[PDB]
Write an enzyme that holds these catalytic residues in place. Structure first.
Site, PDB file in Angstrom:
ATOM      1  N   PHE B  26       7.949  12.702  -6.668  1.00  0.00           N
ATOM      2  CA  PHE B  26       8.702  13.523  -5.758  1.00  0.00           C
ATOM      3  C   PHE B  26       8.805  13.008  -4.308  1.00  0.00           C
ATOM      4  O   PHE B  26       9.518  13.606  -3.516  1.00  0.00           O
ATOM      5  CB  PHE B  26       8.043  14.890  -5.680  1.00  0.00           C
ATOM      6  CG  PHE B  26       8.110  15.661  -6.954  1.00  0.00           C
ATOM      7  CD1 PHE B  26       9.297  16.267  -7.345  1.00  0.00           C
ATOM      8  CD2 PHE B  26       6.987  15.798  -7.750  1.00  0.00           C
ATOM      9  CE1 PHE B  26       9.362  17.017  -8.509  1.00  0.00           C
ATOM     10  CE2 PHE B  26       7.042  16.537  -8.921  1.00  0.00           C
ATOM     11  CZ  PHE B  26       8.229  17.149  -9.300  1.00  0.00           C
ATOM     12  N   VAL B  29       5.983   6.989   0.604  1.00  0.00           N
ATOM     13  CA  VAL B  29       5.541   6.559   1.932  1.00  0.00           C
ATOM     14  C   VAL B  29       6.258   5.222   2.187  1.00  0.00           C
ATOM     15  O   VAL B  29       6.205   4.304   1.362  1.00  0.00           O
ATOM     16  CB  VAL B  29       4.017   6.401   2.043  1.00  0.00           C
ATOM     17  CG1 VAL B  29       3.563   5.821   3.401  1.00  0.00           C
ATOM     18  CG2 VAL B  29       3.330   7.711   1.776  1.00  0.00           C
ATOM     19  N   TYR B  97      -0.166   3.966  11.019  1.00  0.00           N
ATOM     20  CA  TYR B  97      -0.110   2.970  10.013  1.00  0.00           C
ATOM     21  C   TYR B  97      -1.504   2.347   9.860  1.00  0.00           C
ATOM     22  O   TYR B  97      -2.090   1.794  10.822  1.00  0.00           O
ATOM     23  CB  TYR B  97       0.919   1.872  10.323  1.00  0.00           C
ATOM     24  CG  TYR B  97       0.969   0.762   9.284  1.00  0.00           C
ATOM     25  CD1 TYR B  97       1.455   0.987   8.029  1.00  0.00           C
ATOM     26  CD2 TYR B  97       0.494  -0.512   9.571  1.00  0.00           C
ATOM     27  CE1 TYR B  97       1.497  -0.031   7.089  1.00  0.00           C
ATOM     28  CE2 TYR B  97       0.572  -1.533   8.667  1.00  0.00           C
ATOM     29  CZ  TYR B  97       1.062  -1.290   7.424  1.00  0.00           C
ATOM     30  OH  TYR B  97       1.092  -2.320   6.505  1.00  0.00           O
ATOM     31  N   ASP B 152      -8.498  17.622  -1.849  1.00  0.00           N
ATOM     32  CA  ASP B 152      -8.091  16.430  -2.575  1.00  0.00           C
ATOM     33  C   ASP B 152      -8.782  15.141  -2.073  1.00  0.00           C
ATOM     34  O   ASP B 152      -8.199  14.064  -2.034  1.00  0.00           O
ATOM     35  CB  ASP B 152      -6.567  16.313  -2.415  1.00  0.00           C
ATOM     36  CG  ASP B 152      -5.898  15.516  -3.524  1.00  0.00           C
ATOM     37  OD1 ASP B 152      -6.557  15.039  -4.455  1.00  0.00           O
ATOM     38  OD2 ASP B 152      -4.670  15.371  -3.430  1.00  0.00           O
ATOM     39  N   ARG B 156      -8.274   7.213  -3.334  1.00  0.00           N
ATOM     40  CA  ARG B 156      -6.854   7.060  -3.248  1.00  0.00           C
ATOM     41  C   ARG B 156      -6.203   7.734  -2.054  1.00  0.00           C
ATOM     42  O   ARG B 156      -5.102   7.400  -1.729  1.00  0.00           O
ATOM     43  CB  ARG B 156      -6.194   7.553  -4.539  1.00  0.00           C
ATOM     44  CG  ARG B 156      -6.351   9.038  -4.759  1.00  0.00           C
ATOM     45  CD  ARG B 156      -5.529   9.583  -5.956  1.00  0.00           C
ATOM     46  NE  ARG B 156      -5.860  11.006  -6.066  1.00  0.00           N
ATOM     47  CZ  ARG B 156      -6.961  11.480  -6.669  1.00  0.00           C
ATOM     48  NH1 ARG B 156      -7.825  10.669  -7.325  1.00  0.00           N
ATOM     49  NH2 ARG B 156      -7.188  12.781  -6.652  1.00  0.00           N
ATOM     50  N   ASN B 157      -6.876   8.698  -1.436  1.00  0.00           N
ATOM     51  CA  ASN B 157      -6.396   9.513  -0.301  1.00  0.00           C
ATOM     52  C   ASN B 157      -7.092   9.195   0.993  1.00  0.00           C
ATOM     53  O   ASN B 157      -6.943   9.926   1.994  1.00  0.00           O
ATOM     54  CB  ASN B 157      -6.564  11.011  -0.622  1.00  0.00           C
ATOM     55  CG  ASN B 157      -5.589  11.453  -1.699  1.00  0.00           C
ATOM     56  OD1 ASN B 157      -4.520  10.853  -1.821  1.00  0.00           O
ATOM     57  ND2 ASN B 157      -5.976  12.415  -2.564  1.00  0.00           N
ATOM     58  N   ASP B 170      -3.607  12.489   3.315  1.00  0.00           N
ATOM     59  CA  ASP B 170      -3.094  13.296   2.207  1.00  0.00           C
ATOM     60  C   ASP B 170      -3.563  14.738   2.281  1.00  0.00           C
ATOM     61  O   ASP B 170      -4.299  15.239   1.431  1.00  0.00           O
ATOM     62  CB  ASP B 170      -3.336  12.595   0.864  1.00  0.00           C
ATOM     63  CG  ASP B 170      -2.391  11.344   0.670  1.00  0.00           C
ATOM     64  OD1 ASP B 170      -1.205  11.425   1.036  1.00  0.00           O
ATOM     65  OD2 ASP B 170      -2.796  10.270   0.159  1.00  0.00           O
TER      66      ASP B 170
HETATM   67  C1  LIG Z   1      -1.917   6.366  -1.504  1.00  0.00           C
HETATM   68  O1  LIG Z   1      -0.725   5.929  -0.861  1.00  0.00           O
HETATM   69  C2  LIG Z   1       0.135   5.004  -1.489  1.00  0.00           C
HETATM   70  C3  LIG Z   1       0.774   5.622  -2.704  1.00  0.00           C
HETATM   71  O2  LIG Z   1       1.207   4.914  -3.604  1.00  0.00           O
HETATM   72  N1  LIG Z   1       1.062   6.903  -2.633  1.00  0.00           N
HETATM   73  C4  LIG Z   1       1.890   7.537  -3.727  1.00  0.00           C
HETATM   74  C5  LIG Z   1       1.017   7.871  -4.960  1.00  0.00           C
HETATM   75  C6  LIG Z   1       2.571   8.615  -3.188  1.00  0.00           C
HETATM   76  C7  LIG Z   1       2.534   9.913  -3.694  1.00  0.00           C
HETATM   77  C8  LIG Z   1       3.242  10.936  -3.097  1.00  0.00           C
HETATM   78  C9  LIG Z   1       4.049  10.662  -2.000  1.00  0.00           C
HETATM   79  N2  LIG Z   1       4.691  11.659  -1.372  1.00  0.00           N
HETATM   80  C10 LIG Z   1       5.247  11.593  -0.168  1.00  0.00           C
HETATM   81  C11 LIG Z   1       5.644  12.825   0.115  1.00  0.00           C
HETATM   82  F1  LIG Z   1       6.291  13.210   1.178  1.00  0.00           F
HETATM   83  C12 LIG Z   1       5.273  13.632  -0.859  1.00  0.00           C
HETATM   84  N3  LIG Z   1       4.694  12.859  -1.734  1.00  0.00           N
HETATM   85  N4  LIG Z   1       4.096   9.412  -1.521  1.00  0.00           N
HETATM   86  C13 LIG Z   1       3.379   8.362  -2.114  1.00  0.00           C
HETATM   87  C14 LIG Z   1       1.334   4.747  -0.548  1.00  0.00           C
HETATM   88  C15 LIG Z   1       0.918   4.102   0.791  1.00  0.00           C
HETATM   89  C16 LIG Z   1      -0.027   2.945   0.591  1.00  0.00           C
HETATM   90  C17 LIG Z   1      -0.066   1.907   1.600  1.00  0.00           C
HETATM   91  N5  LIG Z   1      -0.202   0.574   1.408  1.00  0.00           N
HETATM   92  C18 LIG Z   1      -0.446  -0.236   2.467  1.00  0.00           C
HETATM   93  C19 LIG Z   1      -0.535  -1.658   2.298  1.00  0.00           C
HETATM   94  C20 LIG Z   1      -0.517   0.293   3.745  1.00  0.00           C
HETATM   95  C21 LIG Z   1      -0.432   1.665   3.919  1.00  0.00           C
HETATM   96  N6  LIG Z   1      -0.570   2.212   5.109  1.00  0.00           N
HETATM   97  C22 LIG Z   1      -0.391   3.529   5.432  1.00  0.00           C
HETATM   98  C23 LIG Z   1      -0.013   4.640   4.740  1.00  0.00           C
HETATM   99  C24 LIG Z   1      -0.003   5.654   5.627  1.00  0.00           C
HETATM  100  C25 LIG Z   1       0.326   7.098   5.405  1.00  0.00           C
HETATM  101  N7  LIG Z   1      -0.371   5.238   6.814  1.00  0.00           N
HETATM  102  N8  LIG Z   1      -0.604   3.934   6.691  1.00  0.00           N
HETATM  103  N9  LIG Z   1      -0.218   2.411   2.826  1.00  0.00           N
HETATM  104  C26 LIG Z   1      -0.126   2.519  -0.798  1.00  0.00           C
HETATM  105  C27 LIG Z   1      -0.592   3.657  -1.766  1.00  0.00           C
END
Ligand SMILES: CO[C@]1(C(=O)N[C@@H](C)c2ccc(-n3cc(F)cn3)nc2)CC[C@@H](c2nc(C)cc(Nc3cc(C)[nH]n3)n2)CC1
Ligand SMILES: CO[C@]1(C(=O)N[C@@H](C)c2ccc(-n3cc(F)cn3)nc2)CC[C@@H](c2nc(C)cc(Nc3cc(C)[nH]n3)n2)CC1
Lengths: 287, 290
Positions: B26, B29, B97, B152, B156-157, B170
Site C-alpha cells: 500500500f 519510501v 534520511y 511495532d 525492520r523498523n 515506523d
Molecule cells: C523498512 O523500510 C524499507 C522497506 O522496504 N519498507 C517497506 C516494507 C515499506 C512498507 C510500507 C511502506 N509504506 C509507506 C507508507 F506511506 C505506508 N506504507 N513503505 C515501505 C524502505 C526504506 C529502506 C531504506 N533503505 C536505505 C538504503 C536507506 C533508507 N533510509 C531511510 C528510510 C527512512 C524513512 N529514512 N531513511 N531506507 C529499506 C527498507
C-alpha cells in the site's frame, strides 16, 4: 481473544468433510505473493472423492503474518464452506494438522481478471469483443446475486479479486473481508462506496458501487480507477458528485449502468438482479 | 480532511523525489531531496513516505497518525520529522534520511560484507551490538515517558544513520495511552505475531510492557545478526507455544547475561518484565564490563 478461539477450533480435527490429509498435497510453483502470504499451485490426490490428482491453488501465510492476516484466512475458510456457485471460487478444504495452515481452493488457469485484461486488447495483445466483457460482467453479477441472497457482503469487489478459469469463466475470489450481514477499513479507497468512506457501512448496495468500479475496469481492459486523483482527495470529489467520465470504447448504455451503481443514495443503485437483467438484455439485443 | 499545520507544511515545488528505497502493498519510501528545508540553505537529502493508488482508509489513517506522533516527539534515536506536503496532491511525509537502511538489513549485510562480525563502519563486535540495543532502549524510554506505545518494535523498523546511530521509525501503529496506560482495540492487530507479547496476542492489550516484550525479540534479532524469530514455526502456533511457556533458545552468539535480559522481557506476567530505564541500565552495565 477471538482469534485464539478460531485458531484452536480450527486445529481440532472435527469436520472431516473439509480436512485434507497433508501427505496427499504436493505443492508446485508460486503463482503469486504478497507481503504476508502467497498462492501456490498444487496437486491433490484423492481430493473430495476424485480419482488421481486434481490441480488446486493453495493459500498460505508467510512468517511475518499478523493476527489480521490469520483472521482473514480463517474467515475466508469459514465463509466458503457455505457457498457453492459456478462463478464463486470453490473451497476444497484445509490442512490444519501438519505444518502451517493451508487453504485449498479451486485453480483458475488464467489468473486475476485484472491481469488477464491487461494482457488483452479490444477488437470489433489477446483479442476480446464487447460480447466477451459483457459476458464477464454478467457472470460476476450472477455470482453476486447468489451471494446477496445468502446475505453475504463481499466488501472487496475488484478486478484484482476475480479469477479467470478455463473457458474464460469468472470466479469471484478473496473472501477474507466478507461479512454475513444477516474501525478503519482495509478496502482500497477508490473501490469503496461513499457511505463506506464516510460512515464505515457495508451492505450489498456498497458491493453494487464496487461493482460499478469493476465494470469500469473491464471496459477499459484493466485501467486504473480515477487516475491522477490521489485516494486522499476522492472523499471530497465524490461527496460533491464527481464521478469518472465515460471511458473510450464504452457505450452509452454501459456507462449509464456504471453511473447508477455510483448514486449517492444506496437505495437508488440497482440491485444485482437488475444489473444481471441489463446485461442479459444487452446480449440478446446484440445478436 | 487534513488541517494544514504551517509549522510543518513544506512547499511541494521544493521537494524532488528520486528512487524507491522499498515498498509494501500500500505504500513506499522514496529517497528525495528538499530545497531550503527548515532554514538549511540548498538541498538536503531526505526520505519520503507516501501511499500508492490502492491505499485503504486504514493506511491513510496510519500515515496521518505517524505524522501526528512525529510532530510531538524529538529524540536522538527517533527518526526526525521535517514536514509534509499535504495540499496540492498526495500526502508526502518528509523525514530524516538514515543512510544504512534498516537495522535488520544492516545486520544481515554484516554476515557477508567484511570485515563483518568479530566477537570500517562494517566491523562489528558484541560491544557494538550492545550499544545499538542501548540506543534503542533510550529512545523507547523517552517514548514510554511521552505516554506512547510503539507496538511495532522490530529490527525492520529501526533505521541506521550516519555514525551507526539507531533511529526508531515506523510510527504508523503507535498509539497514545495517557488514560489507563494501555491501548486496547476490539479488532485484530496488524503487528506480526512473532513480535507480539502474549497478552497482546490473546487479550488485545498493548502497554509499555508489551513494547518491552517486543524489545526482547529485537534483542534476539540483534544478537543473531538479523535472524528470523521462532525459525520454521508457523505464526498460528505461537498462541499455544507461548501459553505453554516456551520461549526462544539462547542463540549461539549470546551471553548468559544477555539471554537473561531477553527471558525477563518475555515473562508471562507483564509486571515482572523490566521497564525501559532498567533495560538501559542493564545494557550500560554489560557495556562497561568488557
Ligand atoms: C523498512 O523500510 C524499507 C522497506 O522496504 N519498507 C517497506 C516494507 C515499506 C512498507 C510500507 C511502506 N509504506 C509507506 C507508507 F506511506 C505506508 N506504507 N513503505 C515501505 C524502505 C526504506 C529502506 C531504506 N533503505 C536505505 C538504503 C536507506 C533508507 N533510509 C531511510 C528510510 C527512512 C524513512 N529514512 N531513511 N531506507 C529499506 C527498507
Ligand atoms: C491475485 O492473485 C495473485 C497474487 O499475486 N496475489 C498476491 C498479491 C497475494 C496476496 C496475498 C496472498 N495471501 C495468501 C494468504 F494466505 C494470505 N494472503 N497471496 C497472494 C496470486 C495468484 C494468481 C494466479 N495466477 C495464475 C496464472 C493462476 C492463478 N490461479 C488461481 C489462483 C487461485 C486462488 N486459484 N487459482 N492464480 C496471480 C496473482
Amino acid at each position: 481473544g477471538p482469534l485464539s478461539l478460531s485458531v484452536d477450533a480450527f486445529k481440532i480435527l472435527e469436520d472431516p468433510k473439509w480436512e485434507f490429509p497433508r501427505k496427499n498435497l504436493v505443492l508446485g510453483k508460486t503463482l503469486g505473493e504478497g507481503e504476508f502470504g502467497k498462492v501456490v499451485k498444487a496437486t491433490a490426490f484423492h481430493l473430495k472423492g476424485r480419482a488421481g490428482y486434481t490441480t488446486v491453488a493453495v493459500k498460505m501465510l508467510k512468517e511475518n503474518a499478523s493476527p489480521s492476516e490469520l483472521r482473514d484466512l480463517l474467515s475466508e475458510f469459514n465463509v466458503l464452506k457455505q457457498v457453492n456457485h459456478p462463478h464463486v471460487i470453490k473451497l476444497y478444504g484445509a490442512c490444519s494438522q501438519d505444518g502451517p495452515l493451508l487453504l485449498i481452493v479451486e485453480y483458475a488457469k488464467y489468473g486475476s481478471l485484472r491481469g488477464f485484461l491487461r494482457e488483452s486488447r479490444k477488437v470489433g495483445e489477446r483479442a476480446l469483443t464487447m460480447g466477451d466483457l459483457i459476458s464477464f460482467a454478467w457472470q460476476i453479477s450472477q455470482g453476486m446475486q447468489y451471494l446477496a441472497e445468502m446475505k453475504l457482503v463481499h466488501r472487496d469487489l475488484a478486478a484484482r479479486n476475480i479469477l479467470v478459469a478455463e473457458g474464460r469463466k469468472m470466479k469471484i475470489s478473496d473472501f477474507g473481508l466478507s461479512r454475513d450481514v444477516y474501525s478503519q477499513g482495509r478496502i482500497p479507497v477508490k473501490w469503496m462506496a461513499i457511505e463506506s468512506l464516510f460512515d464505515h457501512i457495508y451492505t450489498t448496495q456498497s458491493d453494487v458501487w464496487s461493482f460499478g468500479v469493476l465494470l469500469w475496469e473491464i471496459v477499459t481492459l484493466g485501467g486504473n480507477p480515477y487516475p491522477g486523483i490521489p485516494p486522499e482527495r476522492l472523499f471530497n470529489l465524490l461527496k460533491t458528485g464527481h464521478r469518472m467520465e465515460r471511458p473510450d470504447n464504452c457505450s452509452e448504455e454501459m456507462y449509464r449502468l456504471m453511473l447508477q451503481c455510483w448514486k449517492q443514495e444506496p437505495d437508488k443503485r440497482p440491485v444485482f438482479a437488475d444489473i444481471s437483467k441489463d446485461l442479459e438484455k444487452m446480449m440478446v439485443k446484440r445478436r
